[PDB]
Each structure stands twice: as C-alpha cells, then as structure tokens.
C-alpha cells in the first residue's frame, strides 16, 4: 500500500491517523471489500522484460486508471495497449480484496503546509487585538 | 455529478474545414526573465526592496513555446452560418508537471484574419479553451485525441466575460461531423455572437450549445463559474498539477499592470493530468465584420532555481535564469544582479558518449525448483560463475510473497553485472516471514 | 534504488562538502603566508640586492 | 457537402433547337451556380457566373436562369460549338461538387448500323490469342447493345466494346467488338457471332462465321 | 565507466582482466581480450567568463591548450552556459572574445596570464 | 557532486554552500595575482645597463 | 490575358510521387488563384486544393488532405501539383483553373481552365515494341462490294501512338479506336479500313505503326 497506492510527502509533516466509527458515520456507504493495487508495472512492447512503476507520493498512478475503483477480486490483472505517444507496449496492474469490516475503518493522511503566506488553518478561542504595542506578533500563520 | 444544462438535443455538428497552411503563420514571442515574462512568483512569503533566489516551476528563458491562434468563421457572403477549426485538437502534447500561457501579447494592433490572408482585421482580445486529460488514444474515426481518463475542461463564455471550468468526461456523439459520427473532420467548440455577444448581453448557455453539437459531458463531478473583468489588456494564466489537484492562477487579478501571476483559485483532482490538449475555439461571423483574434502562446514548466528581484512596490519586474547562462550562474551566485568586471571560473564542459564498446554459459536454475527443499536452518546455497544470467524469467516462473532487497536495487540485480552469482534456497513459513531478516532482534 | 541511491548521494556530497571546506581554509592559510613572504622579498631586492 | 445533380444525362436536338438543362441543389444555393462547357481535347470554357450573369466572350443564345435549389441554363439555338458537356458547380460551399454533365447529340441524319464480322490472322493464332472483330458503321443512335453468342452460348467480359469518336458530317458511330479465347476453347467451338440490336435499326441482325 | 584505448605495453600478471592504480579508478589493462590497450579516464575542458560590467561583454576561455583539437560550439562538449554556448591565436585558451593580442600594449589591466591583459573596449592587450 | 544530473538537483539545496567555496577561491586567487604585481613593481623602476 | 500550360502527359508508377506542372503566361499570377480540379471517370470533376502564391498558403480538400501538396513560384509562374501513393483510382486528368476572383477561394469561379495533364499508374509494365494483328481478307470479312480489313496495335505502353496505311497515302474510310487496358496492362487499338475488295487486289494496303516510345516503325502487309 505505501509502495503503489498512498506514500506520504517525507518534506511535509507527514501523520498517519487510522479510526473506525460504528454508528457516528450513518450517513458514509459501506464499499463492499476494501481495495488496493498490490503490484503496479510497465510491459516494454518487445515483451523480453517487464519495468515496475512505484507510485510517486501523494499521486494517482497511470495504473490506477485502468482498475475500477474497487478491484473484482484478489489477484486481479489488467491489461491494456498503450498508444503510441504512450510508447507502446502494455501496461500491467495487479491488485488485491480484502473483506469489509463490521465496522468501516477509514486511514487518513495529514500534511499541514507551512509554505505559503496568503492564508492561516488555526482553531478558534482587544487584548488579541493592537491596543498591545508591547511584546507577541501572533498573527494568522505565524507566532 | 448534476449537469447545468440538458444533453443530446438540437442539431447535429456544423460542417468544420481543416487548414492548417492558414494556421500557424508563426510571430515569434521568446519568453523573457528580465522583463519577468512568465514568472511564477513565490507563493509563499512577500518581499520588498529585497532580492532573493527562490526554486520553484519556472519555464525555461528563450522559450519560443507553442502558437495556437483561434479564426473567424467561414462566412458565406449571403450566410454567415458554417464553422472551420484548426488540428489543434489533434496537437496533443505530454508535459510532466505545469502549464503557462501567454494571453493578448499584441493587442489592438493591425492584423489579418486566418479564415482570408487578403482581408485585415484589427487584433482583438480573446481568451484560450482546452481540455488536459492524463491519457490520450485513437477516436473510432481513428484520428488521434481521445481521452479515456477523466478531463477538466476551460471554456470561455459571453465573448471571454466569463470562464468555466468543469470535471466532465467528454463522450463522443453519433452525429455527422462529431467524434462517433462516419466522416467527421475535426472536433473542437463554435460561438454564435448575435445571442451569445449582443450588446448588454452575455450567454453562459455558449458553453452549453458547443456540448449541445459536438459531445456530451458525463460525471460532471466539479462545475466552477469566475468572472472576467475583459478591461482589454490582457496578462497571464497558469495551471499547476500538484498532488492535491489543479491550481488556477491569473496575472490580472494580483495586478494588471505588472503581469505578475497570482493563484486565483484552486479545483481538486485527485488524478494527475499528463497530457494537454487544445480544443480549437471558432466564432462564425460576417465577412464584412470578421474578427482577427491574437494568439495564446503555451510554455512547459520545469523546476528551476531563479534569482528574483522584488520592487519597493512588491512586484517583480526583473528575474534571473541561472540555468540559462555561465553569467547568469555566476549572478545567481553572488545573488546580485551587476557583478564586477572579472574572469570567473564556471561549469566546466563534459563529454558526451559516442562509440559504446561492452565487455560480456548461460547459469541454471533448475537444482532451486526441482526435488524436495531443505528446511530454514539446513539451508542449501546455489554458485553461478563463468555464465550469463536472466532474472526476468526467474521473477515470472515464481510470485514473489515478499521482496526486501538490502545494498542493492530490486531491478539492479537483474541487469548488474559482477564476479560471481549466489543463490539460496529453503522451505519458510508464512507466520515466520515477518521474524526472518538480515538482522533481527527475534532469534 | 531510488530510497537507497538517495541516502548514498546525500553522504557522498556531505563528505565531500567537508574536504573543500577544509582545502579552501588551508589555501587561505597559505597564501596568507605567501602574502608575507612577498613583503620579505620586496625588502630583500630593496637591501640585499 | 451540397450535392449538385444535372437533370438531362445526354439530350438529342437538330441545330437552331431550344435546350433547357435543370440543376437540382440539396442545400440552397441562393445565386452561387457555374456553367462550364467542355470540348473534347480542349479546357472547359466558363458560361455563366452565379447562374444569374452571361460570362464576357459567351454568345448571347447561352443564358442563366433559376434560383436556390433549382438553377436552368437555356441554349435559345443549337450550333456546333453548342454539343458539348454542360457542368453546373456549387459555389456556396468551401469543397464545390461538379454537376454530372449533360450531352448534346446532332439529330441532322438517321442511319442504320452496317455489321460485319472478319477472322483472326494467322500471327493471331501462332500468338496464342484470338480476336474476332465484330464491326457496326454508321449508326446514328449513341445507345446499342452488342452480345457475343458463340455455339449458342453468351460471351461476357473477354468481349470489349470500342467506339469511334463522331463522324460530325452524318452524326453517326463506328464502334469494333472484339472477343478474345484461349487456344484450346477457339479451337473446340465451331460458331461465332455477334448479335445487335439497335434502336434506329429496324431489325436486330446477326453477324455469324462458322470456323474454318 | 567512460573509457578510451591506444596501444600499450603489456602489463599484469594476466591472472585478473582489471588493473587499478592505487584508487578505485581503473587503468582498465587489456580492454581488448586479444591484445593490451590501456584505458584512459574522461577528459573534458574548462570554462572561464571573462566579463566587463561597463562594457556588458563576456567571453569564453580554456585551459592550457583548445587551439590544437577544440573547436567552438562542439557536439562532444555537453555543457557550456548549460543552455547555448558562450578561431582565435593559441595561448593560454581558444578565447571566443577576438580582435588577438598585440605585441605592444598597455600593462595595466584584468589578470589573465603571462602575456595576454584584459582591456575593456572585445579587445586582449598584452 | 556527481555529473548525473540527480545529483545536481540534490546540490542545489546545499548550492548556497558550494558557491560561497567558489567565491572564497575566487578571492584567494586575486590576492595572489595583486602580491605578485606588487612585488615585480618593486623590483622595476630602477634605471638599467644595457 | 493569361495563358495557363500544362505539362505533357506522364505516367507515374505506383507508390512514386507525380508532379504536374501548370504555367501561367501574362496578367497578374500572385493576386489571382489557382486551382487544381481533376476529371476521373465515373468520379466527374472533383477539386483537390486551391492555392495563391503570394499567400503561399495552399486549401487542400479534406479527403485529399495529407496527400496532395500544392507550390507556386513567382520567378517561373508556375504552379506545381504532388499527387504521392498513386492508385488506379487516383489515376485522372489533372485541370489547373484560375478563379476569376483574386482570393476569396470558398466562392470559386474559374474562368479559365488548363488543357489538362493525364497521369497513369505502371505496376511492373515497361515500354517495348507494339505488336500489330492484321485482319484477313475472307468472305465473311467481305461485305457486299466492300471488304474491311484493319491492323490491331496491341502490346504498346506510353503516348497515344501514329497509326498510318499505306504510309499515310490512304486517309479515306479509316476508323480510330481508343486504346483499351489488358490483363497485361498494354494499351491495344484498331485501325479498320473499309474499302471496295477489288481495290484490295489493285493496291497493296500496308498498315505503318509508329511507336513513339520505343522510336520503332513497323509496316506489314494487312
């Protein structure tokens, strides 16, 4: 899964949160089998050798678009012909099933940018205000 | 994933002629850093007075890019109805990551139109439309310019007072002179500017009657809308692919005068777009009042390291490609623009390969898949020397449960070539997988 | 492979950084003393000589 | 595209006669018509321009009439120059589709066709290919029909039809068959003839040679 | 690893296909099995800018000799300006600035070498 | 660095470093070159026998 | 006035390209346009691509788009036409037409029209010396008071070819007939002359083939 579905940007503060909620999500479907693309790789058009593609971080592989957004079944192969701007040759993505669970476990990854200066992700709370000329800029981003 | 406007309905596709010996009479428009042409502009921070050296998407300075300019109708004398389209649609191009484009270069500036060489209309104001899509394959006609994957599209409306950009995956329609209709030569987008451009009148339905005859836009997942201010300069649009999804960035908004380029807004895609294609926009109109628009010029973004100086007023005017020169290396250096007359040490040259000469009986597998397997502890070791080896077929012949390579590359070990091959076999557990290790604290 | 070819060239260039650091500070400290050597020459062709 | 249709294919008329040629036009073609006039062995000359207006160097007697779908050129006296191609063109669209051409026959003189049939030659023989040459002379009518039957048999494909180009002082035609066999199916067959029928003739008359 | 092969003495016990010399580069013996060639290691040319700030004139220098076999904008030479590049009398380098060196002229001026000074009216005093 | 251009990507985060070294040089090898016209100076400016 | 010549008529293989060549003689050639329109049988007149020469752009039709490529030089004004894959289809006589109109090429009228140049497609045929089939004197050839006898040229390639009898002495009664394609692929035509058979016995009618290709001149008895 992190080498051909989901790698987080190691530049970004990077946080991995895994959580199940039984009864709070009544509102969020449950996906028949939860999926993942257990190999992905690149067939070269003479055949002699086949290239594994790692997925890049935080990025839709060229693999993905050709398995359906869950896999039929584990062990499944997809293949197409690439075009010719493609380069030819064949693309190859495997991917594996696993069973829903009783109650839905969702992963989530979390990069806070510290780039930027247009805008500020704070929680919320005259003293905060400028009527202190003393010591503390504390501003939107920035403390 | 609603649609604003209904589906297959009206007409069928206009006629559309195809010339390309019209099209692409070529003015030149090499991209300048000095005059800040182009300049993505940091994101992140301001500076004033300040000159700093910042690395980010940048397109490369000298870049001529690529010219696509958009042509009046046919215009029959008793009719101005009949439409013709360039093969910019058939003008798809890959770019790895980035797009800049350059809008109204020459404005209000004597021109002739494409559709006739011999009439001459003045330049006028107009805005660029395409469709970038991450994989692109034949049409059922079999001409190039077919998008499986999911495409974003931006189409002006209202003669460029308005922009759309929706999420719709476009789906071909069986109407003569459209993509699954026999006999059908190009696909691209029409205007109609008695209802669409009246005066005081501006139709957003315009980006609708194109869908309405050329194809049919399915899983319309985002539908955005943003005002044009079309005052009649025109500066710079930008669109980035980061991970996130794609940014929209406009010049004018930040500030018209400079041509600075800021991101004005921002629409999530989760899949990554590789190809850029260009839909051909043509509005039909009289011979008497056709229109000659100028043309937009597109440039590949690359990561670069540039030198930027920033004004008292916080706006760039003036930039630096280290990349494009030794003395341009040497300011990016000193990070000073003017540097003192000297002779400086640069880059030095290196040569390039030309006549390859490679140095190089065939090693066998057979004792590892044949009889009866030792157990982990009484592992047996396989030698290969003096032979040539293919791992390829090994890695076919058995599905690899687990594959950890440690001081080497996975895909190194097939292709590397060294003194001598050592292979291992034994029987291993699945609940032991996890504890076997080159080095483990469990023994 | 590209995880380790990223952690051999980042120690590689880290320990190269160290030597020209260490080559450009014993350079300085050379022609610092040729620099002084020069001055005793001009005043032996201004005496001896 | 529009599609131009020429009603007449081929027309008959004495000289000094009226001849009216209908244009039909899928698409409307307001006043966007050309009418060439094409001459065997020499370019085609420009008539009328818009289908409304006599080109300059075009006799008076050709005219243009007619609007939109339907166009008609009148030719108010034939001449000799007159019995050519007509072609009525669209100039309404980028891609213009040619009229399919309507010709122009001299009704001066009516004359029955004259059939005779001559043997290969001996180098023909020893060639290894036979040709029978089946010849019809001055036939008025362009129209006619020539089959080959041979030990009472019909012979398709290996019989080719050549015509000579019009005499111009009877109006007639002179047009050769000539059917080819192989050796040994020249030699087996005994009987061969060719049958014509023909519109000015009053009877269909058979040429017929026995073998030897 | 980028080599190139002239004739050479032979050398080596022959019992190994590799010499080396101290260092992990390879004299690279006996490239040829039939006979010995020794190898040569990558060989490349420097680049000086000799730039006049008032003048806004640069030019392209090289080591020691280019006159011999160098030539400007050379296939075999990947990188100059990193984009494009920037005929002369040899000297010190091939220097893309012309107009040569005089026998006789003003002392002072940039340091370049033994004999050539860098003026700025793109001009080389001596 | 190495010459693969991987490597120069990686040397530009450390670039700031590696043009400061440049600099420093640069200056060493001016000093030498103004040392040594001091010293030939020194040396001329005295009136010659053929 | 301006005069429009084309090229003399040429036979290209397939698979090679053709070049046809229109040359305008007086007027104005930059701001006129010319137009190349070619007449095929059963096809009718169908226009290939338009061109201007001072615009130097060229309209090509779409269905021969990609395939034509349509130049015009000032200094020789002439317009060149390349035709490249020959097929039997493609095969027909090439027009150039000038519209009368300086541009506006999508209303075109032509005023004037070329002679035209005919192109034929050659799969593995090469000239050589025709051979000619006399027909002879029988009383089935006999009809009447007049026997018609004629000499068949067949087995010739390239150019129409001069057919004469009696070295060009007899004119009267003779019937032209056009070239038709073999299974062979070289062209074979008729000359029947009909004339009194006891003018057959009071002169020797010879029959003269000249084949212009192969420069060979053949006459024998008919």
Not at chain 1, 121 to 128: E, R, T, Y
Not at chain 2, 260 to 278: C, E
Request: proline share 5%.
């Amino acid at each position: 899964i992190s080498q051909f579905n989901y790698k987080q940007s190691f530049s970004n503060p990077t946080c991995l949160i895994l959580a199940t909620v039984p009864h709070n999500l009544t509102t969020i479907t449950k996906p028949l089998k939860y999926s993942y693309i257990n190999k992905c790789s690149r067939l070269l058009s003479d055949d002699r050798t086949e290239v594994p593609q790692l997925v890049n971080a935080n990025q839709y592989s060229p693999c993905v678009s050709i398995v359906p957004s869950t896999v039929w079944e584990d062990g499944d192969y997809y293949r197409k012909q690439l075009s010719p701007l493609e380069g030819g040759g064949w693309l190859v993505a495997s991917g594996s099933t696993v069973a829903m669970t009783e109650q839905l476990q969702m992963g989530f990854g979390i990069t806070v940018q510290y780039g930027t200066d247009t805008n500020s992700v704070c929680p919320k709370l005259k003293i905060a205000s400028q009527l202190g000329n003393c010591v503390e800029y504390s501003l939107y981003g920035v403390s | 994933y609603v649609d604003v406007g209904p589906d297959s309905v009206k007409s069928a596709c206009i006629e559309v002629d195809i010339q390309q010996t019209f099209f692409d009479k070529t003015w030149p428009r090499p991209i300048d850093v000095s005059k800040a042409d182009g300049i993505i502009y940091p994101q992140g921070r301001t500076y004033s007075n300040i000159t700093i050296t910042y690395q980010g998407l940048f397109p490369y300075q000298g870049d001529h890019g690529d010219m696509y300019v958009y042509s009046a109708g046919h215009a029959t004398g008793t009719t101005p109805q009949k439409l013709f389209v360039a093969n910019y649609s058939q003008d798809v191009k890959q770019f790895a990551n980035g797009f800049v484009v350059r809008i109204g270069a020459a404005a209000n500036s004597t021109g002739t139109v494409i559709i006739s060489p011999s009439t001459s209309a003045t330049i006028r104001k107009i805005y660029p439309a395409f469709m970038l899509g991450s994989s692109v394959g034949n049409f059922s006609d079999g001409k190039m310019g077919r998008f499986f994957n999911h495409t974003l599209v931006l189409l002006p409306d209202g003669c460029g007072t308005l922009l759309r950009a929706f999420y719709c995956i476009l789906e071909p329609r069986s109407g003569n002179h459209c993509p699954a209709g026999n006999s059908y030569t190009s696909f691209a987008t029409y205007h109609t500017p008695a209802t669409d451009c009246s005066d005081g009148n501006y139709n957003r339905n315009a980006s609708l009657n194109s869908f309405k005859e050329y194809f049919n836009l399915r899983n319309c997942t985002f539908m955005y809308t943003y005002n044009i201010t079309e005052d009649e300069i025109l500066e710079w649009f930008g669109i980035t692919q980061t991970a996130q999804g794609v940014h929209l960035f406009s010049s004018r908004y930040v500030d018209l005068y400079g041509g600075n380029m800021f991101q004005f807004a921002t629409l999530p895609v989760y899949d990554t777009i590789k190809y850029y294609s260009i839909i051909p926009h043509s509005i039909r109109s009289i011979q008497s009042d056709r229109k000659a628009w100028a043309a937009f010029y597109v440039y590949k973004l690359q990561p670069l390291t540039f030198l930027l100086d920033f004004s008292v007023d916080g706006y760039i005017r003036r930039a630096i490609d280290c990349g494009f020169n030794d003395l341009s290396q040497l300011h990016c250096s000193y990070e000073s623009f003017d540097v003192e007359s000297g002779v400086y040490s640069v880059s030095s040259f290196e040569a390039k390969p030309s006549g390859s000469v490679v140095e190089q009986v065939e090693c066998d597998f057979s004792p590892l898949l044949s009889g009866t397997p030792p157990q982990v502890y009484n592992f047996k070791r396989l030698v290969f020397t003096n032979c040539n080896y293919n791992l390829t077929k090994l890695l076919s012949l058995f599905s690899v449960n687990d594959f950890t390579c440690s001081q080497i590359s996975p895909a190194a070990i097939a292709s590397n070539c060294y003194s001598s091959l050592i292979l291992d076999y034994f029987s291993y557990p699945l609940s032991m997988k996890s504890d076997l290790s080159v080095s483990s604290a469990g023994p | 492979d590209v995880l380790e070819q990223d952690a051999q060239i980042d120690r590689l260039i880290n320990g190269r950084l160290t030597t020209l650091n260490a080559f450009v500070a014993q350079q300085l400290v050379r022609s610092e003393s040729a620099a002084l050597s020069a001055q005793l020459a001009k005043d032996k062709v201004n005496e001896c000589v | 595209d529009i599609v131009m249709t020429q009603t007449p294919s081929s027309l008959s008329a004495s000289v000094g006669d009226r001849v009216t040629i209908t244009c039909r036009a899928s698409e409307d073609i307001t006043s966007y018509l050309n009418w060439y006039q094409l001459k065997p062995g020499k370019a085609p000359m420009f008539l009328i321009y818009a289908a409304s207006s006599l080109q300059s160097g075009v006799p008076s007697r050709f005219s243009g009439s007619g609007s939109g779908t339907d166009f008609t050129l009148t030719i108010s006296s034939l001449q000799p120059e007159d019995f050519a191609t007509y072609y009525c063109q669209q100039s309404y669209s980028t891609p213009p589709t040619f009229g399919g051409g309507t010709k122009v026959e001299i009704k001066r003189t009516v004359a029955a066709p004259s059939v005779f049939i001559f043997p290969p030659s001996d180098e023909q023989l020893k060639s290894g290919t036979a040709s029978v040459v089946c010849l019809l002379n001055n036939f008025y009518p362009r129209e006619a029909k020539v089959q080959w039957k041979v030990d009472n048999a019909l012979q398709s494909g290996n019989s080719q039809e050549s015509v000579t180009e019009q005499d111009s002082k009877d109006s007639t035609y002179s047009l050769s068959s000539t059917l080819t066999l192989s050796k040994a199916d020249y030699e087996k067959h005994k009987v061969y003839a060719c049958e014509v029928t023909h519109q000015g003739l009053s009877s269909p008359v058979t040429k017929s040679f026995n073998r030897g | 690893g980028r080599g190139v092969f002239q004739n050479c003495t032979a050398v080596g016990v022959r019992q190994q296909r590799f010499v080396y010399d101290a260092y992990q580069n390879l004299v690279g013996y006996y490239s040829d099995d039939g006979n010995y060639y020794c190898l040569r290691a990558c060989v490349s040319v420097p680049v000086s800018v000799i730039y006049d700030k008032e003048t806004k004139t640069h030019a392209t220098l090289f080591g020691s000799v280019a006159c011999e076999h160098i030539s400007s904008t050379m296939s075999q030479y990947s990188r100059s300006t990193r984009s494009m590049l920037k005929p002369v009398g040899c000297v010190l380098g091939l220097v893309n600035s012309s107009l040569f060196v005089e026998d006789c002229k003003l002392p002072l001026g940039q340091s370049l070498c033994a004999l050539p000074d860098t003026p700025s009216t793109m001009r080389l005093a001596s | 660095c190495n010459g693969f251009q991987k490597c120069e990507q990686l040397l530009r985060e450390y670039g700031q470093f590696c043009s400061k070294i440049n600099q420093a040089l640069h200056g060493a090898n001016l000093r030498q070159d103004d040392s040594v016209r001091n010293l030939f100076a020194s040396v001329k400016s005295s009136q010659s026998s053929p | 006035q301006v005069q429009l010549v084309q090229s003399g008529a040429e036979v290209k293989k397939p698979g090679s390209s053709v070049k046809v060549s229109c040359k305008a003689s007086g007027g104005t050639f930059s701001i006129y346009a010319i137009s190349w329109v070619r007449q095929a049988p059963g096809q009718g007149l169908e226009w290939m691509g338009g061109i201007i020469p001072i615009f130097g752009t060229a309209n090509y039709a779409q269905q021969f788009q990609g395939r034509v490529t349509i130049t015009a030089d000032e200094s020789t004004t002439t317009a060149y036409m390349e035709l490249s894959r020959l097929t039997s289809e493609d095969t027909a006589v090439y027009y150039c037409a000038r519209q009368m109109t300086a541009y506006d090429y999508w209303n075109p009228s032509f005023d004037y029209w070329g002679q035209g140049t005919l192109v034929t497609v050659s799969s593995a045929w090469s000239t050589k010396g025709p051979s000619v089939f006399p027909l002879a004197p029988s009383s089935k050839s006999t009809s009447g008071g007049t026997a018609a006898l004629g000499c068949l040229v067949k087995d010739y390639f390239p150019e129409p070819v001069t057919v004469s009898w009696n070295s060009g002495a007899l004119t009267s009664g003779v019937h032209t007939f056009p070239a038709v394609l073999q299974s062979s692929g070289l062209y074979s035509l008729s000359s029947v002359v009909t004339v009194p058979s006891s003018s057959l016995g009071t002169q020797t009618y010879i029959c003269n083939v000249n084949h212009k290709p192969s420069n060979t001149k053949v006459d024998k008895r008919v």
